[model samples]
Target: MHVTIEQAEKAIQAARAKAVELGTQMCIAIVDSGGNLKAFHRMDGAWVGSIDIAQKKAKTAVFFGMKTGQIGALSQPGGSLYGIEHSNQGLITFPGGIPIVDADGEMSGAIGVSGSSVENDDAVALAGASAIGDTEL
Candidate 1:
């Protein structure tokens, strides 16, 4: 099934909660399967510059059908898929962007978290994705 506002909001809330649990403010974003924004939240004190990145993270995940971190290895210098980051209006080739899927493994959307270390961002994003009951990373 396609992502709905209800699912997006649930993801956003879970991501926010994870950020709080980690004691960091974050920019959380969720996008539909088509890579359009569904829900977003910039926690108080989150880095303002991360606003665009947060959105881009979700979009990147949607476009690639894989976590952005997975793209990192291939996007690095001299890698097979190097320079892919410059595609699709640019992409965020790092941790924090995760593709979301439903119980039946249908791609539903993506969630991205920024404004913290890459590890934290990844964890937070996963928390959001899990709330949506995604079986695919």
Candidate 2:
């Protein structure tokens, strides 16, 4: 099922909180299971350049049904998916994007975080994904 706007917002809120906790500004993007952007938020002071990167990361995660970093690993030279990022109208294959799975183990959407180190981005995205089932959908 597609992610509702409310759920996307909840994920963004959680991502924003995590960004703040890490003392970093971030642009967060949430995309439905079909890879359509459902919500986006760019914190004040966040890098404008990251706006597109965040959305692309979300789409990339949903498109592949895995973490963007995993895709990154595979996309690097010597991997089977090398150059895979070149096929998706440009994709962000770095850390920070994560699929949002439901209680039943079905992916509902994805969250992407940018505007910081890859590690911080991944942490922020994780925080957002963790909020997926914190309440009844």
Candidate 3:
């Protein structure tokens, strides 16, 4: 599954708008189902260091086809999936990453945002995903 370039652009635009609306600067990253980057943005005033972190978060969600927050539980203490986290270059087991599915419920990609509080970052990410109209997927 992979998101079209158009979809990736839409997600970026929506995420950027949401960040500005909330008076926050953000780093947004979109990655394909294969965990490759498709699009990215670092808003004015956003910390330069957050760009890679955002991309990693997006890659993590796309690779797992699940929200990054879920990875935390799977990687906890003695969990069987703990090793998976250490197996990749772009992997983030945190809450601000989310997968973007297509209308057919296929995992198209993912979106991640950083530079704000975790909850706010997640909110912006969700807004971007929603703008892509993959809610039912």
TM-score of each: 0.96, 0.94, 0.90
User: Which stretches of candidate 2 lie above 4 Å from their native place?
Assistant: 134-137
Worst 10 residues of 1 by lDDT: 128-137
As a whole number from 0 to 100, the lDDT of residue 45 in candidate 1 is 100
lDDT of each residue in 35-136, candidate 3, tens digit only: 888988899899887798899889888877777878887888798677777778647787778889888788888998888888788889989988985732
How should the candidates be ordered by lDDT, best one leading? 1, 2, 3
TM-score of 1: 0.96
For residues 1-137, write the lDDT of model 1, one tens digit per residue. Answer: 78889988989998999999999999999998999888899999999978988999999998978988998978888899888888889899889999999888888889988999989999999999999877364
Ranking by TM-score: 1, 2, 3
lDDT of each candidate versus the true structure: 0.89, 0.88, 0.84
- Number of the top-ranking candidate, with lDDT as the measure: 1
Model 2 TM-score, 2 decimals: 0.94
**Candidate 1 error regions (>4 Å):** 135-137
Residues 1-137 of candidate 2: C-alpha lDDT, one tens digit per residue? 67789989989999999999999999999998888889999999999999999999999888888889988888778998988887879999999989988777778888989999999999999999888752112
Q: How close is candidate 3 to the true structure, as a TM-score?
A: 0.90
